[PDB]
Symmetry: C2
Subunit: 291 residues, 2 copies
């Protein structure tokens, strides 16, 4: 079902770190107007880690309100505790989220059977479409393709965000699944390829700052137009790179600030983009024609 360019929206903050509700509202409107197909609220890019449970609820609520049913909203509800993931996911359901995005438990390093039981327990506890999320580099754990395939048999497990950037492996997963659940790219650099290979969309960092362009790249890639996909992606390829010069979402928040869209707010332990990356980022934005 949910297809195309799916922005993992930043959570705009005032300089003191408070959520900048006004900027958030404008960003959501801007995304819908520019062609973004769906929004992931409070994912990794949205600083899920440093917003409280009540702040998760408010950001999710506000995005849904502004969206006003124009596009589906996915709520980031991952946690490294199964019980906590259940509570976050139930809250998302009650707020009227269309689906929930759940990163694999990070830090505690569950076994593959543990990941299976984690997601099974969540699926069975909450009637909401669930999207798995694999990002071994951040989590210390790698949900295998085999476990991913096992999980697609569970009702309410409807997709996986594959952030490995490993294209052959993602193709292998898409092929093994044979449509049993959706595969989304979680790696902007290679997303155009994955989508040409059958992925349903891109849960994107770059879409934060190039929503029109990324909406077009996903549309043509889904349509299997390889040449159009190469060409349109090429125009924003350097952004997929520069946006990770420091840990996401550090660069992307700075990029939006240079666009005059949000203030500099960002919560410790994350920090504003280091001084030396600011000029190279502004240059990349100018090159891409963003500013």
């Amino acid at each position: 079902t949910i297809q195309g360019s799916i922005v993992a929206i930043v959570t705009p903050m005032l300089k003191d770190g408070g959520v900048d509700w006004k900027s958030l509202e404008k960003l959501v409107e801007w995304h819908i107007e520019q062609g973004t197909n769906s929004i992931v609220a409070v994912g990794t890019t949205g600083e899920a880690s440093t917003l409280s449970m009540e702040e998760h609820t408010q950001v999710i609520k506000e995005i849904i309100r502004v969206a006003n049913k124009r596009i589906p909203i996915i709520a980031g509800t991952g946690a490294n505790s199964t019980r906590e993931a259940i509570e976050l996911t139930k809250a998302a359901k009650d707020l009227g989220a269309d689906a929930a995005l759940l990163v694999t438990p990070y830090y505690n390093k569950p076994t593959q059977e543990g990941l299976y039981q984690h997601y099974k327990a969540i699926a069975e506890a909450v009637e909401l479409p669930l999207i798995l999320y694999n990002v071994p580099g951040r989590t210390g754990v790698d949900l295998s393709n085999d476990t991913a395939v096992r999980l697609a048999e569970i009702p309410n497990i409807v997709g996986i965000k594959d952030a490995t950037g490993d294209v052959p492996r993602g193709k292998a997963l898409i092929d093994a699944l044979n449509g049993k659940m959706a595969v989304y790219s979680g790696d902007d650099e290679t997303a155009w390829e994955l989508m040409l290979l059958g992925a349903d969309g891109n849960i994107s960092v770059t879409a934060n700052i190039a929503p029109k362009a990324m909406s077009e790249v996903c549309a043509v890639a889904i349509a299997k137009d390889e040449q159009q996909a190469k060409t349109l992606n090429n125009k924003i390829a350097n952004l997929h790179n520069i946006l990770f010069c420091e840990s996401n979402p550090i660069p992307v928040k700075w990029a939006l600030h240079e666009m005059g869209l949000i203030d500099t707010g960002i919560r410790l332990p994350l920090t504003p983009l280091a001084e030396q990356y600011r000029e190279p980022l502004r240059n990349a934005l100018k090159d891409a024609g963003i500013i």
Copy 2:
């Protein structure tokens, strides 16, 4: 100041995952009796991630109560949010913890400067001895020796738990600190070595099942007795390996079960040790004369 065998105690649980208070009390008394020099409450091994905020407090409170000042108690108070780390560390201070152990923020991957400011903010917020904890394979971030040496300048940053298992690197850290803060091994396999090279102790997993033997390994290693350190470590060297056959604390909780000291409870996403590892574990315990 704090030296020797510092057990990162498990949190015993009933089959339904409820904390087993009686068994926890007995473990603490057993450690004290057996020569364990300090206890870390609700560290990684203690399943910090799956215990609620109240349970974090209850467990800290109970270990302190039962210890009754016979040995220092160090509270695990890590978080990937700086605000939340402060709150946990303040609670730990309030409970009478002797120090706090704070893993580097996991999953959200702060920069080196972010790690510095995170810990600096915590130190300035809470008048309590703090112990850094670096375990890159779990957290997705590596606190460099450089950043650690910088943080050693902050008054109440009194040590670091180095779980890299990289002895040349741990030696380099010890030499560069030249006494400004303590270095503790966070790797049982190489702890004896690090202690011979200058570490003040071992914040140990193996000490959960072999408190006596680890107490002695540390004592002779800290006393710079290389031959006795090796000979004593040899007796429990296979344990350092087998206790990680699946992610800690899965194997150690089961080992304690095999010893008859705790029940099988462990909280999702963690799972009881896989059947295939149970007999090899039993054997290792018999070989080491634990059972």
